[PDB]
Amino acid sequence: SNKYVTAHFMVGIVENYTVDDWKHDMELAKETGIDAFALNCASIDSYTDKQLAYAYEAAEEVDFKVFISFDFAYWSNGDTARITSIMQTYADHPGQFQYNGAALVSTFVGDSFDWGPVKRAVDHPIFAVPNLQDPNWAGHATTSIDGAFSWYAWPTDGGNSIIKGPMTTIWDDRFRNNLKDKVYMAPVSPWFSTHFNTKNWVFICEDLPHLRWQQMLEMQPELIEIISWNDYGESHYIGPYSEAHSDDGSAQWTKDFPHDAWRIIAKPYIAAYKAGEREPTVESDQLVYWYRPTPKAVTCSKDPLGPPNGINLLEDSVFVTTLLTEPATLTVGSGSLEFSVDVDAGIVTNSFPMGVGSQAFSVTRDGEEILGGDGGLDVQDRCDYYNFNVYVGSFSA
Amino acid sequence: SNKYVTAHFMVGIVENYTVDDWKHDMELAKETGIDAFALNCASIDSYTDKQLAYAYEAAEEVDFKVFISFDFAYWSNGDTARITSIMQTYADHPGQFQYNGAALVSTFVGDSFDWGPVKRAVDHPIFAVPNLQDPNWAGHATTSIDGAFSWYAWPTDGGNSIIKGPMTTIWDDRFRNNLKDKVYMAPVSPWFSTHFNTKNWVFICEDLPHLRWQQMLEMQPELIEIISWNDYGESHYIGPYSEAHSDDGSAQWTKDFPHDAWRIIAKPYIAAYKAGEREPTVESDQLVYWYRPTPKAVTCSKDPLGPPNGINLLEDSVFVTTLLTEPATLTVGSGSLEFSVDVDAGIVTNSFPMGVGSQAFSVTRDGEEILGGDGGLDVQDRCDYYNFNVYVGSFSA
Amino acid sequence: SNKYVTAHFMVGIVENYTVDDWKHDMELAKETGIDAFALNCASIDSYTDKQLAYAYEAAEEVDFKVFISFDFAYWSNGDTARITSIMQTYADHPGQFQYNGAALVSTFVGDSFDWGPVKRAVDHPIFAVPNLQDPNWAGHATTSIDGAFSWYAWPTDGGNSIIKGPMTTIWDDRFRNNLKDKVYMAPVSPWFSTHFNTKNWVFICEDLPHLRWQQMLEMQPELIEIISWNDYGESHYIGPYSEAHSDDGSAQWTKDFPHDAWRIIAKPYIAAYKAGEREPTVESDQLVYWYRPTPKAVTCSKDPLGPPNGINLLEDSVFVTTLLTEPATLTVGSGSLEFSVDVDAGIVTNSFPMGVGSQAFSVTRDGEEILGGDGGLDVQDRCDYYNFNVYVGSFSA
Amino acid sequence: KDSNKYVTAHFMVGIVENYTVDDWKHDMELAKETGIDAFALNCASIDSYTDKQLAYAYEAAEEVDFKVFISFDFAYWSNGDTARITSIMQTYADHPGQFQYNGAALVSTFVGDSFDWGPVKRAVDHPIFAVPNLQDPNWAGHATTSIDGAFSWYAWPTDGGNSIIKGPMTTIWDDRFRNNLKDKVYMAPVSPWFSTHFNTKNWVFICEDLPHLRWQQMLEMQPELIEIISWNDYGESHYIGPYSEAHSDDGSAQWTKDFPHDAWRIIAKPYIAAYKAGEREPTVESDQLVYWYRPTPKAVTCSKDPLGPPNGINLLEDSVFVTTLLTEPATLTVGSGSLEFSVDVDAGIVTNSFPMGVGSQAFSVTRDGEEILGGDGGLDVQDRCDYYNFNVYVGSFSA
Amino acid sequence: LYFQGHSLPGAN
Ligand SMILES: OC[C@H]1O[C@H](O[C@@H]2[C@@H](O)[C@@H](O[C@@H]3[C@@H](O)[C@@H](O[C@@H]4[C@@H](O)[C@@H](O)O[C@H](CO)[C@H]4O)O[C@H](CO)[C@H]3O)O[C@H](CO)[C@H]2O)[C@H](O)[C@@H](O)[C@@H]1O
Ligand SMILES: OC[C@H]1O[C@H](O[C@@H]2[C@@H](O)[C@@H](O[C@@H]3[C@@H](O)[C@@H](O[C@@H]4[C@@H](O)[C@@H](O)O[C@H](CO)[C@H]4O)O[C@H](CO)[C@H]3O)O[C@H](CO)[C@H]2O)[C@H](O)[C@@H](O)[C@@H]1O
Ligand SMILES: OC[C@H]1O[C@H](O[C@@H]2[C@@H](O)[C@@H](O[C@@H]3[C@@H](O)[C@@H](O[C@@H]4[C@@H](O)[C@H](O)O[C@H](CO)[C@H]4O)O[C@H](CO)[C@H]3O)O[C@H](CO)[C@H]2O)[C@H](O)[C@@H](O)[C@@H]1O
Ligand SMILES: OC[C@H]1O[C@H](O[C@@H]2[C@@H](O)[C@@H](O[C@@H]3[C@@H](O)[C@@H](O)O[C@H](CO)[C@H]3O)O[C@H](CO)[C@H]2O)[C@H](O)[C@@H](O)[C@@H]1O
Ligand SMILES: OC[C@H]1O[C@H](O[C@@H]2[C@@H](O)[C@@H](O[C@@H]3[C@@H](O)[C@@H](O)O[C@H](CO)[C@H]3O)O[C@H](CO)[C@H]2O)[C@H](O)[C@@H](O)[C@@H]1O
Ligand SMILES: OC[C@H]1O[C@H](O[C@@H]2[C@@H](O)[C@@H](O[C@@H]3[C@@H](O)[C@@H](O)O[C@H](CO)[C@H]3O)O[C@H](CO)[C@H]2O)[C@H](O)[C@@H](O)[C@@H]1O
Ligand SMILES: OC[C@H]1O[C@H](O[C@@H]2[C@@H](O)[C@@H](O[C@@H]3[C@@H](O)[C@@H](O)O[C@H](CO)[C@H]3O)O[C@H](CO)[C@H]2O)[C@H](O)[C@@H](O)[C@@H]1O
Ligand SMILES: OC[C@H]1O[C@H](O[C@@H]2[C@@H](O)[C@@H](O)O[C@H](CO)[C@H]2O)[C@H](O)[C@@H](O)[C@@H]1O
Ligand code: NA
Ligand code: NA
C-alpha cells in the first residue's frame, strides 16, 4: 500500500481559480511532502464542475494527485446519480489519487451515503473512505466503505463542551479498534478558531501544530489528511493565503496571518511518517513560532459577533518549535518579559508567557546567535474584532 | 402466547440506582400497561451485574418483569461464557419475564451472536429475540433465535438515512414476511433527536408519538418494545427524568423536557393492542401536546457540534393529540397564531404551524371549555445549543 | 485581580520524581485553580538541582508555574553564592512564577538572610517574599524584601503552649499592619498533626479546612500559600498521596488517608478570592467530610512515640462541609449515633459527635436523597500507633 | 525497579471454593516458612466464588503478614472483561495484603498476551506492575499492552508447541525471554514436575532431576522474580504445597491424594535464600535428604484406564531420585527393591538418580561409617496399577 | 541535561 498524506482543500472558496492558481497550491503542497488534495466540494456551487476540472488538470500538469471530498453538508443522499457521473469522469483520470489501485473518494459527514450503487456503476474501482462520526459505525457501516476518515482533530470528550488540551489519541484508538481490516485516515490539524455568525468557537490546540505529528509517528495510520490547506474560516489552514480565493468573511482574521511556517514543522514529520521512522530528522537549524494577537481577556471595541465560545480555556502563550541539529539556548522576548530555556537537538516545542508589545526570538549555540529575529506581529491589548487565529512565522539558519 | 409490551431501559446510565429507584420506574411502567423493561446493559460497565441485581430484585418486589438486552455495541461474541453465566443466574429468576415459558432475552445489534451455545448451557428454556439489522437474515438465521426485534422505529431508507415522514410499515412488513412463523417484536418510538459528537441528527417523527400506536393495532405484532423508557440522549424516553441517573451530556436538552404525557397516549393503545382490538377506548377527556423549543432555522453559533442532520425536513409545528369520549372543538394559540379544529371522538392528532412565544390549548364542547391551559414552555427564536427534543405536556378533565 | 494562590511543595521527598510525576501533581493543582508551586528545597539534598530542573521543565510543559522556597532549616546565610547561581538559572525560565514582572522567591524561615546581594547579582528582577517570624521585622527588615510570608496557619498565642481554636486572623492583621505597602502572602492550611521523634504534636484545627478560606475572602491578601501540597509528615497535604515520593516515616499515618477532597472546598474559594468576590459560588451539590481515625483518648498498643502534645484539646467530631445550590437537610450517622441538621444553600461546615464504628452521610432535599454514602474509614476504638491525621472523603451530585 | 528479589507461587483459586480464611492462613504460613513472598492467585471469571475467595485470600495475607497478587487466568477471562478486571484492581491494588513490586501492585496472567493493561492502569489510582504470561519471547520485547515485564510458562523441557523432549532442562527459553526483556522485569518459572491425566491434557514433560536442577539455574540466572509452578495444582503434579483438606477434587485426587510433595520445599528453602541474597551456592543448615520416585515402572499397563497412557512416558527413566543437603561430605546408599546403590556425595546440595526397582525403597546417609539419617521410602514401588499415575511420591529424612 | 519540551504522556 505505502503511506500517504493528504490535505483538505476548500473548493467552495476558489470559484475564480485558474489552472495556474491550482498548480501554485499543489507545488507548495508537493514541496511539503503532501501527496494529494482532498477537493471538498458542494452540490450547490455552480463552479464545482469547472473547478474540479481545473484541479485534475493542474494535478496532471504538475504530477500531483487529487481526490474528491463530497461535502455532505450540501450533497444529499438523493444526489447519487450526479456523484456517480462525477466519479465516471475522474476515477480513471491520471490526476486521481489511487490507493491500492482504486480511486480514493471521501466526504465531510455523509455517514449514511451508500457507496455501493456508485461503485457498481463506475468501471474503475473506487476506494471509499468517508468521514464518519461514530467509530462504531465505521466498524459496521452498511454503505460499502473501505475505511474511515475521522474529523476528531482537536480535543473533545464526546459532547458540545469545549475541553482543555492537550490532544489525546483516544478517538483515534476508538476508530482504529473498529477499522481492524480497513483503512483509517487520521486527521492532523494545527489550530481551530472560527468567528462567523453561524459558528463562533475555538478548540484548545496550543502545541497541537507540533504534538499531533508526534502522535502520527506513534500511531502509523494508513492515511493522513491535514485539516486544512485553505479553510481560512476555521483557522486551520497551513497553505498560503491565496490572492484568488473568494473571501467568505474570514479575511478579517486571516488576511494578515500567514500560517505557512507550519509547513516547516510538517515536512520532517511527513517524511518520517512515510518512512515509518519513530522520530523526525532535522536537516538544518530552523525555528517556528505562533501566537494569538491579544491576551485572551482583551475585550474588543467593534465586533458585531460575541467573543468565541471556549476562549477562557486558552493560554496566553507564545509557542516556539525549534528544529535544531545540536542543542542550543532559546531566548524569547515577549513584550517587557524575557525568557530562556536550553533546548535539545531535534524538534522541540516550548511555550512562553505572552506579553503585550514586541516579540523577539533568538537561538544561540556556544555564543553564536544561530538564528533569530522579531516576530512579524506585535501583541496588542486592544482589538477591533475577536481574533483567536494565530500569527505564524519562522527563522532559518 | 399472549401479547406483551416492553420498554427499552438504559442500564448504562443508572450506575447509582438503588432498588427503590428501579421500583419507581417499574411502578410508572405498570400504570402504563408495560409488561417488562428490556435491561440494556454493556459489558464495559463495572456496575452491570449490580444494577442487573437490583433490577431483578425490584421486579419481583412489585410484580413487574424484566429481561436482559445485551448491547452488542459493547458485548462481543468473545463474551459467550459471561453471557451464559448471566443467563444461568436470571433465566429462572422470579423477576425474569417469561414468554411462553421461556426466559425472554434480546440485544442491541449482535446479529451474528450465536444463542445455540447459550441455550444448550442453561437449563431453563430461553426465548432469543435479538435485534437484527437485516429482515432477510431474520429468516435464515443460524444463531438459534426465536424471533427478531426491529430497530427501524423511524422513517428511514436504511444506513440511518433520514427521510420525510410519515412513518410507514415498509420495514415491519419485511420482517414479518421473512419471520414467517417466528416471533416479531415491533419497535415503538415517539421521537428521535440526539446531539453528541458520535451522533448528531433527528429522524422525522412529528405525529409519530400517536401514529405508531395506531400502526400497532393494525399490525398486531407478537411483541412490542418501546424505544425507550429513559434514553435521554436520543430524546425518545417516555419515562420520567429520573434524579438518580447519570448525565451523559443529554441533560442539556432533556432536563427541562418532560415526556411523561406521552404515556397518556400509550396506555389506551397498549390495552387495545393486548385485547387485539382494532381501535382504542377513550375513558376520559384528555389532551397531549408536544413541540420543539425553537423554530428549526434558529442559529446557535456557540454550539461546537453544529445543527443536527435532518432538521431541514422537520416542520415548525405544535402537535396535539386529543383523547375524547365525544366530539369537541380544539383551539390552539401558538405565539400570535390562532387555530381551531373540530376533532372527532377517539384519539386524533392535529398539528399546527408553530409561532414564537407562548402556547395555549383548549378543548370546548357546546361552547363550554372542558380542558385547557398554557403550554409549559414558550417557543423562542434564540438559543445557546441546538435542541431538537420536544417539550411534552397534557391536560385532563 | 493580580491575586494568586500557591501551594507549598516538599522537594525533599521527591528524589525519585520524574518530570511526569511532576506534571501529574501540577495538573491536579491547575484543576484546583492554584497558580504555582512553592518548591521547598534544602541545600543538603543531593537531588535538589535535579528535581528543581524537573519541576521547572514540568511547569513549562503543562503551562504551570513554580518558584523556589529556600528552606533555611537547611540553607544558611553562608550559601548566598549558591542561592544566587540558582536564581540565575531560573529567574527567567518560562516556568518561573512572575509577580509584577519579578521572579518570586520565598523561604522557610531565614529571617536574617539578605536578598540584596542576590538581587544585585541576578539580572532578572526578583520579588523576595521570605517567611518572617516577627510581624515587626516584616515592617522594618533590612534584607531588601518585597513582602513577607506568614507561617501562622494554625491557632497559636505567641508561645509554645498548644491552644484551642478556632483560627482567628490576629496574626494576619499584625502582618498586614506592618506590610501596608508591600506584599502579604497569607498561609492557608487545613490541618496539622506530626508524629516523629523530632516533632510530635497537633495544632487544633477542626473546621479549618473551610474556615481559613472564609478568612481569606475577608482578609484579601496579595498572595496565598497553601500549606501544603504534599507535606505528609505534618498532615496538611491537600495533594494526592503520590507513590513516587520517598516515605520519611509519615506513611504510617498518611498512606490510607486521602486529603484530595479538601480541594473541593478550595476550588470555589480560590475562584472567589482571585475574582475579589467575598462569597464563593456553588456550582453543583457536593459534600466533603473528614475525621480522625480514633476518639482522642484511645491509648494505643505499640507506638514507640508517645501521644502527641495537644491531643487533649481536640474534639471527637466528624466534620462535614456541604456545598449546595439550594438548602437541604444533612444527616450524619457516626457509629451508633445519628444526627441531622438543616443546611442553607452555599458552603457550610457542621461538626458532629464522633461515634466508634462506621460513618454515613446523606443530604436530602424534598425527601429525595441527592448525595450520600459511607465514609471510607470506620472509627476505631483501638489502634497500634497514634494517628491524629484525618481521613477525608466526598460525595457529589 | 526493585533492589530486591522475590519468590512467588502459583495458587489455583479455582479449586478452593470451600476455603475459609483459616485454610488460606495455613497455606500462607507454610509458604512463609519456605521463604516464599506471595501467592499468585490464579482465578477465573466464570467461578461464582472468585470474589469470595480473592477476598478471603487478601484478608488471610494481611492477617499473617503474607502478600498476594492476582493472576488472571485468560483461559477463562477474556479481553472483553476489562471493566471487571479494572474494578478488582481498584479493590486490591492498595490492599494491605497486596504484594508491591517496588511500590506498584503486582499483577500477572496465565496466557492473555493481547490483553491491554493501559486502560486498567489508567483507571486505577494506585500504580500497577503488569507482568503477564507471554508465550512469544519476541513479543515480550515490543508488546503494546503496557507491560512492565513478562512471566514465562516455559518451566519444562520443550521445543515449543507443548512438545515433549528429553531433558535435562536448559535455560534456552529463559535467555530468549531475558534477551527481549531488556530493561523490563523477567519473572522466571520454577516447576518440579509435570504429569497430567485428563481428557483435555494427558502427558508428561521430562523433569527427573528438575526439582533441584531448576533452583541451581535460578542462582546463575538471577531473574528479577520467580513464580513457582505451583503451590497446589494437583491436576498437573507440580504442587509443592500440602495436599489440602478443603480443596475441591477435580479428578486429580486419583494420582495425588497419597502423593505428598511437601519434602520438595526442603530443597526450595535454601535456594530461595541464596537467590534473594544474590548468592551462587545454597547454604546447607543441617544434614537432610529428599527423595522422589514414580509409583510404577513406566511400562506398566493399566487396561482399565480410559485415558490410556500419558504422552511422553517413553522418554522418562525408571529411576529413584535423591537430593542430599549435607554440611560435610558423606555416603549415600539407596535400596530400590532388590537393587542396591552407594555413592559418595559432596557437601552442599547434590542430586543423584538410581535405577528403580519394584518393591521396598530405602535410603541411608552415613559419614565415616556412621549413620546420620535414613529410613524407608513412604511408598512401595508397584508393578501393577489401576490407573496410569506418573506423578511422584516425595519424602525426606533429617539427621 | 536535556528535556523533551512539551511532550506526550510518557517521556519519564
Ligand atoms: O458567502 C460566501 C460564499 O458563499 C459561497 O461559497 C461558499 C464558500 O464560502 C465555502 O463555504 C465554507 C462553508 O461551507 C464551511 O465549510 C466547512 C468547513 O468550515 C469545515 O467545517 O469543514 C467542512 C468540510 O470541509 C465544511 O463544510 O465553512 C467555511 C468557513 O469555515 C466556508 O468558507 O464553501 C461553500 C460550499 O462549498 C460555498 O458554497 C458562494 O459561492 C461564494 O460566492 C461566497 O463567497
Ligand atoms: O530519612 C528520610 C529522608 O531524609 C532525607 O530527605 C528529607 C525529606 O524527608 C524532607 O524532610 C522533611 C523535613 O525537612 C521537615 O520539613 C519541614 C516541614 O514539615 C514543615 O515544617 O515546613 C518546613 C518547610 O516546609 C520543613 O522544613 O519535616 C518533613 C516532615 O514533616 C520532612 O519530610 O525534606 C528534607 C529536606 O529537603 C530531606 O532532606 C533524605 O534525603 C531522604 O532520602 C530520606 O528519605
Ligand atoms: O459518558 C459519560 C458516562 O459514560 C459511561 O456511561 C455510559 C452511559 O452514558 C450510557 O452510554 C449510552 C451509549 O451507550 C448510547 O446508548 C445507545 C442508545 O442511545 C440507543 O437507544 O441505542 C443503543 C441501544 O439502545 C445504545 O447503545 O448513547 C446513549 C445516549 O443516547 C448513552 O447514554 O450507557 C453506556 C453503556 O451501558 C455507559 O457505559 C460511564 O459509565 C458513566 O459514569 C458516565 O456518566
Ligand atoms: O446488513 C444490513 C442491511 O440489511 C438489509 O439489507 C439486506 C442486504 O444486505 C442483502 O443482504 C443479504 C443477506 O441477507 C444475506 O442473506 O446474504 C446475502 C449475500 O451475502 C446478502 O447480500 O440483501 C438482503 C435481501 O435483499 C437485504 O435484506 C437492509 O435492507 C439494509 O438496509 C441493511 O443495511
Ligand atoms: O437507528 C438509530 C440508532 O443508530 C445507531 O445504531 C446503529 C444501529 O441501529 C444499526 O443501524 C442500522 C444500520 O446498520 C443500517 O444498515 O440501517 C438501519 C436502519 O436505518 C440502522 O438501524 O447498526 C449500526 C452499526 O452498528 C448502529 O450504529 C446508534 O448507535 C443508536 O444509538 C441509534 O439508536
Ligand atoms: O505448557 C503447559 C501448559 O499447556 C497448556 O496451556 C498452554 C499454554 O501454556 C500455552 O502453551 C504454549 C504454546 O503456545 C506453545 O507455543 O509452546 C509453549 C511451550 O511449550 C507452550 O507453553 O498456550 C497454549 C494455547 O493457549 C495453552 O493451551 C495447559 O492448558 C496448561 O495447563 C499447561 O500448564
Ligand atoms: O471439574 C469439577 C470442578 O470444576 C470447576 O472448578 C474448576 C477447578 O477445577 C479449576 O480447574 C483447573 C483448570 O482451570 C486447569 O488449570 O486444570 C486444572 C488441573 O490441572 C484444574 O484444576 O479451576 C477452574 C477455573 O478457575 C474451576 O472452574 C467447579 O467450579 C468445581 O466446583 C468442580 O470441582
Ligand atoms: O447553520 C446552517 C449551516 O451553518 C454552518 O455552516 C455554514 C455554511 O453553511 C455556510 O453558510 O458558510 C458559513 C460560514 O461562512 C458556515 O458557518 C453549520 O456549521 C452547518 O453545518 C449548517 O448546515
Ligand atoms: Na427474504
Ligand atoms: Na494454570
Numbering used by the authors:
A (entry chain C), B (entry chain B), C (entry chain A): 35 to 431
D (entry chain D): 33 to 431
E (entry chain X): 6 to 17
Article, verbatim:
Complexes of AnGH71C with glucose and nigerotriose/nigerotetraose were obtained by soaking crystals with ligand and clearly revealed the binding cleft within the N-terminal (β/α)8-barrel domain. The two protein molecules of the glucose-soaked crystals each contain two glucose molecules located in the same position in the binding cleft, while each of the four protein molecules of the nigerotetraose-soaked crystals contain distinct combinations of nigerotriose and nigerotetraose occupying different subsites within the cleft. Crystals of the apo protein and glucose-soaked crystals were of the C121 space group with similar unit cell dimensions and contained 2 molecules in the asymmetric unit, while the nigerotetraose soak was determined in P1 containing 4 molecules in the asymmetric unit. When overlaid and considered together, the annotation of the −4 to +3 subsites can be observed separated by two acidic residues (Asp265 and Glu268) found at the beginning of the loop between β8 and α8 of the (β/α)8-barrel domain. An additional nigerotriose molecule was also observed on the surface of the cleft in chain B extending from the +3 subsite and could be bound in +4, +5, and +6 subsites though the trisaccharide makes few direct interactions with the protein and its position on the surface of the cleft makes the subsite annotations questionable and could result from soaking ligand in high concentrations. Within different chains of the oligosaccharide-soaked crystal, both α- and β-anomers of nigerotetraose were observed occupying the -4 to -1 subsites. When the α-anomer is present, resembling the substrate configuration, a water molecule is positioned close to Asp265, 3.2 Å from the C1 atom of the sugar at the reducing end. This position is taken over by the hydroxyl of the β-anomer, the configuration of the inverted product. AnGH71C has an active site water molecule, proposed here to act as the catalytic nucleophile, positioned by the dyad’s aspartate in a small gap along the protein surface and in line with the C1 of α-anomer products. Only small protein structural changes are observed upon ligand binding in AnGH71C with the most significant being the packing of the loop between β6 and α6 over the substrate along the +1 to +3 sites leading to interactions with Gly193 and Asn194.
Glycoside hydrolase family 71 (GH71) includes α-1,3-glucan degrading enzymes which could be exploited for biotechnological applications; however, the family is presently poorly understood. To increase our understanding of GH71, we have performed a phylogenetic analysis of the family and detailed biochemical analysis of two of the five GH71 enzymes encoded by Aspergillus nidulans (AnGH71B and -C). We present the first structure of a GH71 protein, AnGH71C, including structures with carbohydrate ligands. These structures revealed a conserved acidic dyad (DxxE), found to be crucial for activity, and active site water coordination consistent with a classical inverting GH mechanism.
